[PDB]
Amino acid sequence: PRALPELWAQPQRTLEARVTYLAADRYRRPPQNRSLALLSELEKRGDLHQLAVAYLATGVPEPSSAKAILEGMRSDLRWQSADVLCDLGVAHYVASKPLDAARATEELREALRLFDTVLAMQPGHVQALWNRSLVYRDLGLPLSAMKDLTEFEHRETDEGWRSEARDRRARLSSTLRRKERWLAADQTGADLINRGAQELARALTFVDVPLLRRDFYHAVRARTSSTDVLALLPLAERLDASVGSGTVLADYVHQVAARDFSRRAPLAEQYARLISGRIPESEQDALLQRFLTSDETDLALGALAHVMQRLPAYASELVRRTQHDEDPWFRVLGLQAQAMLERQQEHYKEALAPLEQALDICRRERLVYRCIFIENDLSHVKSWLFRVNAAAQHARDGLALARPNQWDLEGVMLQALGNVARQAADVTLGRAYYGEALLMAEGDKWSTRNIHQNLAHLAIWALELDEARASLDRAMDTGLPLTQHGVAALVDVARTRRSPRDALMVEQALAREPGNTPGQRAYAKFLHGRILVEVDPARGRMLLDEAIRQAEALPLDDVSAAHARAYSYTSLIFADADTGDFIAALARFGAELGFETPARCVLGLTADTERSLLVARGAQGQLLSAYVPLRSSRFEAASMEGAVPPEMLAALQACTLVDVLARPPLQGRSGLLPPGIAWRYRTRAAAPPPPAGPGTHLVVNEVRYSEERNEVPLQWLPRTAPGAEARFLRDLAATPTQVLEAISTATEIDLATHGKVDPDSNFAYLLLAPGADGRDTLFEDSIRASQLTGAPLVVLAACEGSLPSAFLAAGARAVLAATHPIPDLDSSAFFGAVRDRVLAGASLAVAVRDERLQWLSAGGDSEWVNAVLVFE
């Protein structure tokens, strides 16, 4: 496999990146055809590495062909795995360039993941360092790119490559100029506060910096004389002119420049010392009460905004005192305080309205410092509500607002983007954003601890518990105690990598954050029990039991209480499995759902972080268990083949039907058991009683969707019950309102529509025909709220935040859903044969198993019929 002189003879390197092929990796000056015969020569001669590298690094790049060749090469041993993965990352990076930002982000993420893998299995890969610096630069993370280029010049030996890396790093180092300008602006604002109009000449050169408005607010309140407030007027006018036409900061100056300073002077200096931090925490409350009992309301607003971070009881006073403020700055501040007060009680959905109101106010009034905080809060709220798309959009908008001048706020917005990525389980981009924010937040200790806690959480998701341990140690090394986020990370990590200070640190962290709501108190009880249960079984078991009891006393809409109960049951199940008590494991499996576990023919599944449990009972009642205390990868691929050991499969092949109690997130997955075994997903103690009288079989088929939906209508030939009615909703009659009306009476429901999850809200819906309002969806919340009096057997074809769970909660006696695209109207035949079988007298699970066997034995599609799941 020789090299081709003609392919690499050009004096100019075609691409910025570096390929691993030796002849194509030699110093050629940076950028400003191939023959179908001589590429076929490389293909036939066995030199596929040069074939891919030629597809990438000469002529017009064609990253798709090189990508295909490199995926083919990944399963070969004649090539270094590091080189192949680096070239695949280069192909993804090259493919990223022509696309738009939304689509280029995915390719950049794939390239970054490949380069991270290469540098993890080869720390000194010079090509990977170069290409990862390029990828970081393309993601708007210049500091990470400079770090990579520094490591490159450490690791590179070629002179030309080192020189070009030095030039690229020098070009990238212009971000430090923005950092130093922000530092100068911050110091000028502090001097403006501390001296007034003496720093007026310098302050007027920082008007475009967003922080100058708040520093002007602080400066006006700290002046002990009327002459000083008059002297600050030019800055007020020039700040007003930079944001809009109307003057507000100059009216505030005239307002404070008339008050009797015989009473304001003792308080202006007190406010200045409070802002500067000279007031001790004990002394702060008396000064605050003195502020609130005076006629000087601006000092009260400033002090309340300064104090409410530690004492959220003053946020209510701040909200009251700026409901109708003539300054939009303080109106947005009050709306932000309202949103934070809503959040502290876990009313995140109710925290959205003041946030959007403040967003509109600050967007119209062109005040950027408050806009950045409002966008950060909106991103956090929507990420908590699992609206990752809108949260990411808000984070991007805030980052764009804060990028030119606000160095600290743009690091905050990078943290917001990392949080959005962490919610979406995006480890690579979350790590990239958080590392960039960590590089930007050097010296800061508060942001460092939060960044490291989030990095530990990201490592926990990726099952890199050593890196999570390291990042938790880094977070605690800042001298600040962890928060409940850090405590959750620690209780996930301290199980296998316990540290002598882990329990004591958890006690301190939960002492100061016990929880505002009863659900948060239950969650803190859970966390304490979870860390404690590993060391002291009796006390930790008691704490987990009482956390379960506390969570059971609150409504099911309490998110923290539900999390506390579910996680306490998970911890107790795995603590019973850890000591070898697998009877208690199944007992808890049953007890979580409210019914005693079946004595035979039952399977239970759990998987928390690095531990997996599959305990089952056979036909004779014998118990089998599959405990994996130390996992290496989370359950994925949406199909669980190989989870059940062959011994357990042999035990469960003697059962008439198997009740599978799959705890989340393992519920609703296909391929758990072979097609020869009849089984069901049991989620309730018993099914709703059958109705009396001939029912109305409802068929929703041939739905005419909207033009932009682009979905194929589905036909259905039903099998009505003896003496029943076939209530049909075809074409435009299959509206969400009519469907909701019909499903609440029908005893047999065949839904020949598509069940899709909302990409934004992550809520499953039923795609239906557009109604009068124009909506064409039936979200699962409307189904859960509805009641099904007929106890129907819902057949849910083409399903894909679970519709079967919603229908079961509504009142359906059983839901069988096909989690795969319909195989050309044979779905009707399959499900009708199943319905006839259950009408004969067989149970639902055994009937669907018999039909599965008769379907695979008749040459039918296997990928579809194996995805039909039975819920009861």
Calpha distance 355→375 (Å, rounded): 8
How far from chain centre, in Å, is Cα 626? 31
Phi, psi of 764 (to 5 degrees): -75, 145
- DSSP 8-class letter at 197: G
Phi, psi of 14 (to 5 degrees): -75, -40
Q: Decide: 429 and 392 in contact? Cβ < 8 Å.
A: no
Residues in the chain: 872
List the Cα angle 199/202/208 in 5-degree steps: 125
Q: Decide: 94 and 62 in contact? Cβ < 8 Å.
A: no
Q: Could you state, in order of their start, the residue ranges of all structural domains in the chain?
A: 36-173, 514-579, 581-679, 696-871
Match 């909703």 to its residue by tokens: 729
Calpha distance 331→337 (Å, rounded): 10
Cis peptide bond prior to 718, omega within 30° of 0: no
Calpha distance 19→57 (Å, rounded): 7
Amino acid at 259: R
Calpha distance 416→435 (Å, rounded): 13
Calpha distance 110→92 (Å, rounded): 7
Calpha distance 750→818 (Å, rounded): 12
Written as one string, the DSSP assignment of 13-71 is: -S-SS--S-TTT-S--BPP----HHHHHHHHHHT-HHHHHHHHHHSSS--HHHHHHHHH
Calpha distance 722→697 (Å, rounded): 11
DSSP H or E run through 631:
none
Strand partners, 754: 767
Helices (H), 477-595: 484-493, 502-512, 518-535, 537-552, 559-578, 582-593
Match 């990525």 to its residue by tokens: 421
Interstrand relation of 725-728 and 696-700 (parallel, antiparallel or unpaired): parallel
CATH class of 696-871: alpha beta
Q: Which long-range contacts (CB under 8 A, 24 or more apart) does 537-545 make?
A: 537/575, 537/579, 540/575, 541/572, 541/575, 544/568, 544/571, 544/572, 544/575, 545/572
- DSSP 8-class letter at 202: H
Calpha distance 300→274 (Å, rounded): 12
Q: Decide: 543 and 503 in contact? Cβ < 8 Å.
A: no
Q: Which one, of 682, 679, 606, 681, lies nearest residue 649 by Cα?
A: 679
What sign has the CA pseudo-torsion 516, 522, 528, 530? negative
Q: What tokens does 174 get?
A: 């212009």
Interstrand relation of 777-779 and 623-628 (parallel, antiparallel or unpaired): unpaired
Match 């966390």 to its residue by tokens: 527
How far from chain centre, in Å, is Cα 751? 31
List the Cα angle 482/485/490 in 5-degree steps: 70
Q: Which one, of 537, 654, 548, 630, lies nearest residue 591 by Cα?
A: 548
Calpha distance 524→537 (Å, rounded): 18
Q: Which one, of 522, 460, 523, lies nearest residue 489 by Cα?
A: 460
List b or e across 544-557, with b for residues whose CB sees 16 or more CB atoms inside 10 angstroms: beebbebbeebeee
User: Beta-strand (E) ranges in 786-867?
Assistant: 793-796, 814-818
Q: What is the resolution of this structure in A?
A: 2.9
Calpha distance 454→467 (Å, rounded): 12
Calpha distance 487→483 (Å, rounded): 6
Q: Decide: 427 and 801 in contact? Cβ < 8 Å.
A: no
Calpha distance 461→492 (Å, rounded): 10
**DSSP three-state, residue 669:** coil
Q: Which long-range contacts (CB under 8 A, 24 or more apart) does 166-172 make?
A: 168/133, 169/145, 172/137, 172/142, 172/145, 172/146
Q: Which one, of 642, 607, 647, 640, lies nearest residue 623 by Cα?
A: 647
Calpha distance 431→457 (Å, rounded): 10
**Using N-to-C axis directions, what is the helix angle for 388-402 and 368-384, rounded to 10°?**
160
Q: Decide: 818 and 653 in contact? Cβ < 8 Å.
A: no
Tally of CA atoms within 13 A in the half-sphere of 159 that contains its CB: 0
- DSSP 8-class letter at 732: T
Phi, psi of 750 (to 5 degrees): -115, 115
Q: Decide: 405 and 181 in contact? Cβ < 8 Å.
A: yes
CATH assignment of 36-173, given 1.20.1740.10, 1.10.3470.10, 1.25.40.10, 3.40.50.800?
1.25.40.10
Q: How determined?
A: cryo-EM
Measured between its terminal Cα atoms, the distance across the chain in Å is 61
Distance (Å) of CA 207 to CA 24, 188, 204, 352: 51, 11, 5, 31
User: Beta-strand (E) ranges in 577-717?
Assistant: 602-607, 612-617, 623-628, 658-662, 679-681, 696-700
Strand partners, 795: 750, 816
Q: Which one, of 461, 869, 421, lies nearest residue 640 by Cα?
A: 869
**DSSP three-state, residue 185:** helix
**Using N-to-C axis directions, what is the helix angle for 159-172 and 142-155, rounded to 10°?**
160
Contacts of 830 (CB under 8 A, 6+ apart): 851, 855, 860, 865, 868
Phi, psi of 574 (to 5 degrees): -75, -25
Q: Which one, of 604, 590, 601, lies nearest residue 677 by Cα?
A: 601
For 665, other C-beta atoms within 10 Å of its C-beta total: 11
Helices (H), 75-174: 81-96, 101-121, 126-138, 142-155, 159-172
Written as one string, the DSSP assignment of 282-325 is: HHHHHHHHHHHTSS-HHHHHHHHHHHTTT-GGGHHHHHHHTTT-
For 596, other C-beta atoms within 10 Å of its C-beta total: 11
Strand partners, 793: 748, 814
Calpha distance 305→315 (Å, rounded): 8
List the Cα angle 791/761/768 in 5-degree steps: 50
For 191, other C-beta atoms within 10 Å of its C-beta total: 16
Q: Decide: 388 and 423 in contact? Cβ < 8 Å.
A: yes
Q: What tokens does 633 get?
A: 């990868």
Written as one string, the DSSP assignment of 441-486 is: TTT-SHHHHHHHHHHHHHHHHTT-HHHHHHHHHHHHTTSSPP-HHH
Q: What tokens does 595 get?
A: 């019914």
Q: What tokens does 504 get?
A: 């004591």
Q: Decide: 594 and 580 in contact? Cβ < 8 Å.
A: no
Q: Decide: 728 and 701 in contact? Cβ < 8 Å.
A: yes
**DSSP three-state, residue 264:** helix
For 222, other C-beta atoms within 10 Å of its C-beta total: 24
Match 């056979």 to its residue by tokens: 618
For 655, other C-beta atoms within 10 Å of its C-beta total: 20
Q: What tokens does 193 get?
A: 């506060």
Strand partners, 624: 616
Calpha distance 747→552 (Å, rounded): 33
Phi, psi of 499 (to 5 degrees): -120, 150
Burial class of residue 433 in the structure, from the number of CB atoms within 10 Å of its CB (0-12 exposed, 13-18 middle, 19+ buried) = buried
Tally of CA atoms within 13 A in the half-sphere of 668 that contains its CB: 16
Calpha distance 547→220 (Å, rounded): 51
Amino acid at 43: E
DSSP H or E run through 396:
helix 388-402
Classify residue 533 as left (phi > 0), alpha (psi -120 to 50) or beta.
Answer: alpha
How far from chain centre, in Å, is Cα 657? 38
- DSSP 8-class letter at 598: P
For 817, other C-beta atoms within 10 Å of its C-beta total: 26
Calpha distance 310→289 (Å, rounded): 16
Calpha distance 421→834 (Å, rounded): 43
**DSSP three-state, residue 627:** strand
Contacts of 555 (CB under 8 A, 6+ apart): 561
Match 């937040």 to its residue by tokens: 441
List the Cα angle 383/117/470 in 5-degree steps: 65
Q: Decide: 689 and 791 in contact? Cβ < 8 Å.
A: yes
Q: Which one, of 748, 747, 742, lies nearest residue 766 by Cα?
A: 742
Calpha distance 18→25 (Å, rounded): 7
- DSSP 8-class letter at 670: B
Distance (Å) of CA 282 to CA 126, 286, 382, 466, 674: 56, 8, 36, 41, 67
* CA-atom Rg of the chain in angstroms: 32
Q: Which one, of 58, 113, 115, 64, lies nearest residue 86 by Cα?
A: 115
Match 């700290």 to its residue by tokens: 222
Helices (H), 778-843: 780-785, 803-810, 826-840
Going edge to edge, which strands form the sheet with 777-779? Answer: 754-757, 764-767, 777-779
Calpha distance 607→605 (Å, rounded): 7
Tally of CA atoms within 13 A in the half-sphere of 720 that contains its CB: 14
Q: Which one, of 433, 441, 448, lies nearest residue 486 by Cα?
A: 448
Going edge to edge, which strands form the sheet with 868-871? Answer: 623-628, 612-617, 602-607, 658-662, 679-681, 868-871, 814-818, 793-796, 748-751, 696-700, 725-728
Contacts of 277 (CB under 8 A, 6+ apart): none
Q: Decide: 857 and 829 in contact? Cβ < 8 Å.
A: no
Q: Decide: 703 and 734 in contact? Cβ < 8 Å.
A: yes
Q: Decide: 462 and 486 in contact? Cβ < 8 Å.
A: no
Q: Decide: 594 and 610 in contact? Cβ < 8 Å.
A: no
Q: Which one, of 163, 181, 159, 182, lies nearest residue 171 by Cα?
A: 163
Q: Decide: 806 and 784 in contact? Cβ < 8 Å.
A: yes
Calpha distance 795→236 (Å, rounded): 68
DSSP H or E run through 248:
none
List b or e across 598-633, with b for residues whose CB sees 16 or more CB atoms inside 10 angstroms: bebbbbbbbbbbbbbbbbbbbeeeeebbbeeeeeee
